[model samples]
Each structure stands twice: as C-alpha cells, then as structure tokens.
Target: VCRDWFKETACRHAKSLGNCRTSQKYRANCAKTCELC
Candidate 1:
C-alpha cells in the first residue's frame, strides 16, 4: 500500500524488477492507499 514511505520502497522494488520492470504491480500496490483515501 502507498504510505509515507511507499515512494522510497517502490523505487527500490522497481529497480529490483530489472529490465522486465514490474513497476505496474509495484505502482498498483502503492495506489491501493490512494484508492482507500
């Protein structure tokens, strides 16, 4: 979920996703918090 710390965490995870890039999933998870709000 997106939290005060999500941006940093997502960035880290995105990098780990490598060339294939799983950013969408990471972003989707992060967006959950936005949706809830």
Candidate 2:
C-alpha cells in the first residue's frame, strides 16, 4: 500500500534536506526512504 513513487535519489535528497519528515509530499510519496514504511 505504501511505497515510494519517486526515485531513490530524490528521496535521499529530501531526507537529507529534512523534508522527508517535514514535507507532506515526501512523507506520502517517499514513504519507504523516509522510514514511513
């Protein structure tokens, strides 16, 4: 049900920028990389 819809690099970048947790887009789309899985 929850999976990253973007590239791994994109998720990595977002995580590095702290967007994975703060950004709703990243949290919803990049769930795997952001540890939301």
Candidate 3:
C-alpha cells in the first residue's frame, strides 16, 4: 500500500516538474523513500 502511495506521489511530482531538470533530484529523493517503505 505504501509503495502504491509513493508511486502515485512520485508520479504527481514528476508531472508537476514537467521536463524540468530540478525534478531529477526530487524524483531521486522521492524514490529513495520507497526503499525504506
């Protein structure tokens, strides 16, 4: 369930960034949290 939530959140954030380079770091950090979840 947490994985699903994380993925959803990540998707939203990625979309929000919309091809911006700054999103790379944000997405990476967001994905890292999934490791613990």
CA lDDT, every prediction?
A: 0.41, 0.75, 0.43
Name the weakest run of 10 consecutive residues (lDDT summed) in model 3.
Answer: 28-37
Deviating ranges (above 4 Å) for candidate 2: none
Highest lDDT model number: 2
Candidate 1, residues 1-37, lDDT tens digits: the string is 3432356555455445541133454445443323321
For model 2, how does the per-residue alpha-carbon lDDT over 1-37 read when each residue is reduced to its tens digit?
7867788767777777788878876876776778875
Q: Which ranges in model 3 have alpha carbons more than 4 Å from their true place?
A: 1-6, 20-37
What TM-score would every model get versus the actual structure? Answer: 0.28, 0.68, 0.29
Model 3 lDDT tens row, 1-37: 2232345566456545552224543444444433322
Winner on lDDT between 1 and 3 is 3
Which pairs clash in the backbone of model 1? Answer: none
RMSD of 2: 1.2
